[PDB]
Design a protein around this ligand. Sequence first.
Ligand SMILES: *[C@@H]1O[C@H](CO[C@@H]2O[C@@H](C)[C@@H](O)[C@@H](O)[C@@H]2O)[C@@H](O[C@@H]2O[C@H](CO)[C@@H](O[C@@H]3O[C@H](CO[C@H]4O[C@H](CO)[C@@H](O)[C@H](O)[C@@H]4O[C@@H]4O[C@H](CO)[C@@H](O[C@@H]5O[C@H](CO[C@]6(C(=O)O)C[C@H](O)[C@@H](NC(C)=O)[C@H]([C@H](O)[C@H](O)CO)O6)[C@H](O)[C@H](O)[C@H]5O)[C@H](O)[C@H]4NC(C)=O)[C@@H](O)[C@H](O[C@H]4O[C@H](CO)[C@@H](O)[C@H](O)[C@@H]4O[C@@H]4O[C@H](CO)[C@@H](O)[C@H](O)[C@H]4NC(C)=O)[C@@H]3O)[C@H](O)[C@H]2NC(C)=O)[C@H](O)[C@H]1NC(C)=O
Ligand SMILES: *[C@@H]1O[C@H](CO[C@@H]2O[C@@H](C)[C@@H](O)[C@@H](O)[C@@H]2O)[C@@H](O[C@@H]2O[C@H](CO)[C@@H](O[C@@H]3O[C@H](CO[C@H]4O[C@H](CO)[C@@H](O)[C@H](O)[C@@H]4O[C@@H]4O[C@H](CO)[C@@H](O[C@@H]5O[C@H](CO)[C@H](O)[C@H](O)[C@H]5O)[C@H](O)[C@H]4NC(C)=O)[C@@H](O)[C@H](O[C@H]4O[C@H](CO)[C@@H](O)[C@H](O)[C@@H]4O[C@@H]4O[C@H](CO)[C@@H](O[C@@H]5O[C@H](CO)[C@H](O)[C@H](O)[C@H]5O)[C@H](O)[C@H]4NC(C)=O)[C@@H]3O)[C@H](O)[C@H]2NC(C)=O)[C@H](O)[C@H]1NC(C)=O
Ligand SMILES: [Cl-]
Ligand SMILES: [Cl-]
Lengths: 207, 209
Amino acid sequence: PSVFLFPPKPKDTLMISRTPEVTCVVVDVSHEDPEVKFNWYVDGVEVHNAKTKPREEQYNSTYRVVSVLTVLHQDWLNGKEYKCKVSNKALPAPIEKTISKAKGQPREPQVYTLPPSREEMTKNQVSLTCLVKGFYPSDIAVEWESNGQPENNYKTTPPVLDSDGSFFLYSKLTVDKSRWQQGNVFSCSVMHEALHNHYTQKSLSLS
Amino acid sequence: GGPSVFLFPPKPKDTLMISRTPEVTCVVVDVSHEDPEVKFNWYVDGVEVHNAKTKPREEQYNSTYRVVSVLTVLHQDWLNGKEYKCKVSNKALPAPIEKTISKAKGQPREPQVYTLPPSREEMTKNQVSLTCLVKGFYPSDIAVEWESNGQPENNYKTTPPVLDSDGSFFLYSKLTVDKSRWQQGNVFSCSVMHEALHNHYTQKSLSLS
Ligand SMILES: *[C@@H]1O[C@H](CO[C@@H]2O[C@@H](C)[C@@H](O)[C@@H](O)[C@@H]2O)[C@@H](O[C@@H]2O[C@H](CO)[C@@H](O[C@@H]3O[C@H](CO[C@H]4O[C@H](CO)[C@@H](O)[C@H](O)[C@@H]4O[C@@H]4O[C@H](CO)[C@@H](O[C@@H]5O[C@H](CO[C@]6(C(=O)O)C[C@H](O)[C@@H](NC(C)=O)[C@H]([C@H](O)[C@H](O)CO)O6)[C@H](O)[C@H](O)[C@H]5O)[C@H](O)[C@H]4NC(C)=O)[C@@H](O)[C@H](O[C@H]4O[C@H](CO)[C@@H](O)[C@H](O)[C@@H]4O[C@@H]4O[C@H](CO)[C@@H](O)[C@H](O)[C@H]4NC(C)=O)[C@@H]3O)[C@H](O)[C@H]2NC(C)=O)[C@H](O)[C@H]1NC(C)=O
Ligand SMILES: *[C@@H]1O[C@H](CO[C@@H]2O[C@@H](C)[C@@H](O)[C@@H](O)[C@@H]2O)[C@@H](O[C@@H]2O[C@H](CO)[C@@H](O[C@@H]3O[C@H](CO[C@H]4O[C@H](CO)[C@@H](O)[C@H](O)[C@@H]4O[C@@H]4O[C@H](CO)[C@@H](O[C@@H]5O[C@H](CO)[C@H](O)[C@H](O)[C@H]5O)[C@H](O)[C@H]4NC(C)=O)[C@@H](O)[C@H](O[C@H]4O[C@H](CO)[C@@H](O)[C@H](O)[C@@H]4O[C@@H]4O[C@H](CO)[C@@H](O[C@@H]5O[C@H](CO)[C@H](O)[C@H](O)[C@H]5O)[C@H](O)[C@H]4NC(C)=O)[C@@H]3O)[C@H](O)[C@H]2NC(C)=O)[C@H](O)[C@H]1NC(C)=O
Ligand SMILES: [Cl-]
Ligand SMILES: [Cl-]
């Protein structure tokens, strides 16, 4: 059987209101050795409050058994080390994967907004750009707002690694050229641990 | 509990540059000890070909074999959407496995390319960032570079193609330059290679003011 350990969503670890969960996925458990017994540890110290989900048989030969652990916000942002430990008869020794927040100094993202280029202004819709660079680790979340209302016609590139070991990304919001003319304000907002209040906003409006 | 086949396409740049070699790799894994021999047959649009380079078997750390076979593809063949089928045979299988690969089947779309300068707030920095927006292209195979005067700049990074809401793709490319070098009106150039541009190449330039 094969063990895969997953980290929480970036907004879940950043907002005091939400619930971050580290997940531990067991795959390839036989119908003759079906017993999977987990053992979680936070800095090697065993915890018992994991919520093992209903065992679901995957559509092939085998089941997959998933254990959800809520993590403390302080702990994950102090990159404590979460050890999943799945035991099965079919295994030689118990398998032990280990996840944590990315090690090293957290670095503040720089957030810049870029307005559509003139060549684009000839088209029906235009492209509002948000550059976010110099941040570490790569766990981040980017959204678009206008008139304090969620804009949702955007796409964001993945974090790309840069020469200093920090990350950058761009987010592109697509709007009707008409709407951007008449100088509406559109806002790019970024949530990252290194920010004060784990949030910054920047904005952009027709000059 | 049987061998698994995986068939990979050529790298984007390799399909787009006349100097590179675009190749199709067919990888067999989970080959057992008692049934280790793997036979490859390769078909280009249904016609069998006999110049793949099949590598020797190679035992992996998990006590199974991995056997691969590499077929070079012609640049024009791949771009015209020929279909490359790898037929793997192995005594542990009920009948041969067949996988087929080709270019992406959707309607080609010319990339539109827009250059963006630094933002005013960025200028207060020691190093500023020149931005290329390549959008609306399809398929996602694309290559992007930067050029100054006539030499290829080498402090750029490019995002992967991102799937847009119309089923085409976009990416951005970022180049980091000295603020004082963008100052003084130097020209920088963003070159894009894509199957559906004329001569498969377009170039856009960025200057101060
Ligand atoms: C049999 O079968 C099985 C199964 O399968 C299936 O089925 C079948 C029938 C078919 O179809 C298939 O195909 C399918 O799939 C199988 O199994 C398998 O296995 C494998 C192995 O073998 C594996 O693999 C792996 O994977 C990984 C990942 O994955 C991912 O992705 C995918 C896609 O496709 C998917 O599917 C998966 O699942 C995943 O995902 C993920 O997950 C996770 C967990 O869970 C998560 O997390 C989480 O999340 C959550 C969320 O939430 C929620 C939301 O959403 O929000 C909540 C809410 O409330 C709700 N909502 C509502 C409205 O309701 C929701 C709900 O619930 C629902 O969902 C809705 O519907 O929810 C939260 O947030 C938490 O907190 C968290 O935690 C996530 O999200 C997801 N995501 C996504 C995107 O999706 C990967 O990664 C891997 O890779 C790795 O590994 C390898 C080796 O191993 C290598 O090669 C690579 O490279 C990698 O590596 C790595 O790397 C890194 C860096 O680089 C490092 O770090 C490390 O260390 C490394 N490692 C090593 C080297 O080792 C792989 O790929 C898979 O997964 C499986 N699958 C499954 C499905 O499970 C089996 O196998 C078979 N058998 C045979 C074939 O024989
Ligand atoms: C044992 O072992 C072995 C080995 O391994 C090793 O060892 C171990 C022990 C450890 O250590 C580890 O770590 C190592 O590695 C194994 O094997 C394995 O197996 C697995 C399975 O099981 C596999 O997996 C797969 O994968 C893939 C990918 O892969 C890649 O990547 C990775 C990372 O991640 C790596 O690892 C690999 O290698 C690969 O890589 C690649 O490769 C290639 C070749 O070479 C390359 O390319 C090339 O290159 C060259 C240079 O060199 C030149 O350039 C040329 O030109 C070319 O050709 C590349 O680059 C690379 N990459 C990188 C590195 O990055 C994936 O894909 C898969 O997945 C898939 O499948 C699955 C199934 O199974 C599923 O689930 C998923 O989902 C997927 O799916 C797919 O998908 C797609 C999309 O999505 C599709 O398509 C589609 O279709 C549709 C229809 O409707 C539509 O049309 C659309 O549009 C489209 O798109 C397809 O179809 C699908 N498929 C299916 C479903 O089927 C997987 O994941 C792996 O790979 C392996 N590995 C190796 C190494 O081999 C075994 O297993 C063991 N055993 C036991 C028992 O355990
Ligand atoms: Cl807490
Ligand atoms: Cl050729």
